[PDB]
Design a protein around this ligand. Structure first.
Ligand SMILES: CCNC(=O)CCC(=O)c1ccccc1
Ligand SMILES: CCNC(=O)CCC(=O)c1ccccc1
Ligand SMILES: [Zn+2]
Ligand SMILES: [Zn+2]
Lengths: 367, 367
């Protein structure tokens, strides 16, 4: 298998389906990447081809150098397929404190114990190498929503300078350059001209894939879709398009309709722990008393192991009682549901009926 | 398969190994029963033949009548093998409040919400029927340690009256009498003459098995073993002997040396959640920093899935981080370890080398 090869097998409108080949395995697209930071065998059994690791959390605990000493993230976790790592920059903004930003990078205090850390394009790429990830994200500077044109431009411009530094750092490390892939991140908030400048800058540097950054941070679905409408066509058509941090099932479907190939979200796992199960008829909160004697599975069609074996009433009782097993079952079902969604998306594009699937999905999900 | 058949296949001193046949399966003895109130398939994979359910917890949440409406405990949990239920009486003493005791039974307030409940010989047997358990424990009155001769005698005498009421309640319910088994509980604290009176009373009533009650409540191992020395021989030799609430690995080995056939304890699960792993070289606390880079499994010989796949360093990191997956792995290993202990006990009795096993076990476990 090659270091990186993205092939598009079928298209419908702006939607694409195909594969990314990498040394550690094949990724079917459009892809959903569960956030890994359940046993790895269970994550694989649900259908995941690749998982996401959070550089920020991993650099705090157990630490990047420690994971490297212990053989890298794949060996440590027992997941032998591709891993994508984020750059750490977003969680520095959202979770750390005492942050000091500069053109060089950022220094920050851990949210766990106030120890001091730093990230930069060079250090982020280095940490992602120590972890051994297969898809490395360039380190950028996040832009809050809403942002003024001036601040969005300044952050996009710095992010593009940092994208070049990320590229050069990755290329300088032979083991990483030869075995991993590097994605760049488009910025520019909701502003078309800035999105175009960013896309142009990233394509001139050249990356293995292109993320749409800066969305899913408060703008609402209508605005997110409007920005995707003009932003995704700016990116190279022949490389994967990754919408970071999205999202809800309906967000995923609409983003695929607009040309997105890859997704990650904490929602399946966070929802699982807080009683929310995804179903083809919309989310349900299993803690609700209406489920206390409901013998049906979480979802009537889901083929996951939880829905084959246990009732809503059982899971309701476990969750009511605070039992860890309840969170395990909810999480396995939700991740499995997300993978079944992606499989239906891939199949419907391959068969030229994705537009109809999206319409049918929405009618039932929002009934 | 019969309702109940206990066969002894081999003996060494006071130790016995054999089988209990019941409608839902065969129980290998000496047996350890994990407390079920991990997925049932995982509990089975570790080697458990039977699990324990706590009547007190189940009658509070989700409730006995609800479990019956939903098809009984086996169907609700997805465990199709034997289940033993305790009577609820011990947890009323240790966990409930506003308790009002009388010759009829006890009324108490839930520790969860102050709702009012009652148990009695008749109601305890009824609840155990609603749950569908296979081995039903008679309802008795617990005796704290230390207890005066007078109080130990009074509680033993009431417990024997309650044992007759439990027997009659069980026998009156045809479905229960024909398909389940009933165990009586010997009381009498540390007093030989009271233990003998209790044994005589229980044998005169007649039960399918006999528990040694009132131990593992503060007396210390030396005293527990001294009481077992004279108490177990008082019980019918041809029926199973069950030491309730025991215990640590070394307690189990010594109790088998004194004629005990069955055991339950929360320790494997409670220890799993609080960082303690059982090994043939004694317990370890995986949270200790000495394990942060330790690539060995929890135990060098254990054949459980956790020890085949993950390192001490991995589990250390999960537990340090409060991750539910860490508690899952520790619990699976600990229950598996307990089952491997029982298997080594059974094999060594069958081969006439249990005395040597007990000596070898203790030398290494306490090294
Ligand atoms: C059962 C999958 N094995 C593990 O999780 C081992 C430990 C590990 O991979 C990890 C990753 C991030 C933070 C803390 C620990
Ligand atoms: C995965 C095994 N299935 C379950 O646990 C279903 C729910 C159940 O059996 C239970 C028992 C006691 C208290 C609360 C729930
Ligand atoms: Zn499911
Ligand atoms: Zn093990």
């Amino acid at each position: 298998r090659p270091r990186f090869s993205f092939s598009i097998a079928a298209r419908e409108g702006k939607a694409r389906t195909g594969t990314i080949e990498m040394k550690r395995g094949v990724i079917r697209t459009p892809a959903f990447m569960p956030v890994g930071t359940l046993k790895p065998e269970t994550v694989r059994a649900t259908g995941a081809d690749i998982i996401l690791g959070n550089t920020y959390h991993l650099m705090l605990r157990p630490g990047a150098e420690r994971i490297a000493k212990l053989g890298g993230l794949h060996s440590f976790m027992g997941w032998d397929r591709p891993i994508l790592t984020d750059s750490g920059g977003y969680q520095v903004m959202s979770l750390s404190s005492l942050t000091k930003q500069s053109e060089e990078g950022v220094t920050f205090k851990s949210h766990l114990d106030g120890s001091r850390h730093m990230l930069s394009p060079e250090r982020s790429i280095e940490i992602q190498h120590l972890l051994g990830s297969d898809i490395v994200m360039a380190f950028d500077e996040s832009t809050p929503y809403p942002a003024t044109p001036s601040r969005a431009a300044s952050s996009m411009e710095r992010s593009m300078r940092w994208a070049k530094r990320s590229r050069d750092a990755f290329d300088s490390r032979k083991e990483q350059a030869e075995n991993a892939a590097l994605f760049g991140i488009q910025q520019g908030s909701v502003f078309e001209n800035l999105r175009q400048q960013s896309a142009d800058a990233l394509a001139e540097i050249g990356f293995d894939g292109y993320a749409v950054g800066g969305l899913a941070v408060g703008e609402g679905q209508d605005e997110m879709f409007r920005v995707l409408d003009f932003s995704v066509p700016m990116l190279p058509d022949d490389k994967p398009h990754y919408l970071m941090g999205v999202g809800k099932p309906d967000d995923i479907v609409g983003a695929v309709e607009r040309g997105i190939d890859m997704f990650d979200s904490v929602l399946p796992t966070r929802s699982g722990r807080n009683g929310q199960a995804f179903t083809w008829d919309g989310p349900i909160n299993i803690r609700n008393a209406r489920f206390s004697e409901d013998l049906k599975p979480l979802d009537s069609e889901c083929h996951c192991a939880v829905c084959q074996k246990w009732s809503r009433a059982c899971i309701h009782a476990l969750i009511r009682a605070g039992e860890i097993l309840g969170a395990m079952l909810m999480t396995e079902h939700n991740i499995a549901f997300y993978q079944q969604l992606m499989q239906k998306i891939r199949d419907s594009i391959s068969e030229g009926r994705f537009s109809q699937f999206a319409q049918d999905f929405r009618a039932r999900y929002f009934a």
